[PDB]
Design a protein around this ligand. Structure first.
Ligand SMILES: Nc1ncnc2c1ncn2[C@@H]1O[C@H](CSCC[C@H](N)C(=O)O)[C@@H](O)[C@H]1O
Ligand SMILES: [Zn+2]
Length: 148
C-alpha cells in the first residue's frame, strides 16, 4: 500500500490504537491499546515544521512560561515543534532498544513525520523510537546509558 492511502484515516484510527499513560521510562509515554502489525503506521508526530536555528529561543520562551516544550528533531536543519499544535505522539519516549521508527513522508507536497512499527507490537507495550548530560532509562540491557 502506498503512503497516502495509509495516511488518510490515521487520525481516526490512531485514537483506537494508542493512548498516553504513566511510563516507567519517564513521565508519560505512548502505549498501544491493541496489537500493531510490523510495518503499520502508528501515529503522526503532529506539529509545526521549523528551522532548527529557531528552537533555542522557542524553548527559552516556553520554559519561561511554564509551558512544556515538545520537539522532534528531523535532522541538523529541521525540527517539529509539538508544543502548541502537537498530539499524543509528543509523549513517545526514547529507547536504546526501540520498537518503532520515524519517517518523514510527503502528502500532497507537504511534510508529515510518521511513526512506524519496527516489529509486531503487543497490546500494553510502550512505544519508543531512537531519538536523533541526561541518562537513559529505557530499561534495556543492551542500553547506551545516555540520551547524549
Ligand atoms: N529513555 C529515556 N530516558 C530518560 N528520559 C527520557 C527517555 N525518553 C524520553 N525521556 C524524557 O522525555 C523527553 C522527551 S518528551 C517524551 C514524553 C516525556 N516522557 C514526558 O512525559 O514529557 C526527553 O527530553 C527526556 O526528558
Ligand atoms: Zn537507555
Amino acid at each position: 500500500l502506498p503512503m497516502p492511502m495509509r495516511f488518510r484515516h490515521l487520525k481516526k484510527t490512531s485514537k483506537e490504537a494508542v493512548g498516553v499513560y504513566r511510563s516507567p521510562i519517564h513521565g508519560r509515554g505512548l502505549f498501544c491499546k491493541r496489537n500493531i502489525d510490523a510495518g503499520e503506521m502508528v501515529i503522526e508526530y503532529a506539529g509545526i515544521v521549523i528551522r532548527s536555528i529557531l528552537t533555542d529561543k522557542r524553548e527559552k520562551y516556553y520554559d519561561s512560561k511554564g509551558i512544556g516544550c515538545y520537539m522532534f528533531r528531523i535532522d541538523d536543519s529541521e525540527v517539529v515543534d509539538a508544543t502548541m499544535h502537537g498530539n499524543a505522539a509528543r509523549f513517545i519516549n526514547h529507547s536504546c532498544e526501540p520498537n518503532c521508527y520515524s519517517r518523514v513522508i510527503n502528502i500532497d507536497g507537504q511534510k508529515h513525520i510518521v511513526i512506524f512499527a519496527m516489529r509486531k507490537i503487543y497490546r500494553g507495550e510502550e512505544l519508543t523510537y531512537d531519538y536523533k548530560k541526561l541518562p537513559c532509562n529505557c530499561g534495556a540491557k543492551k542500553c547506551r546509558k545516555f540520551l547524549n
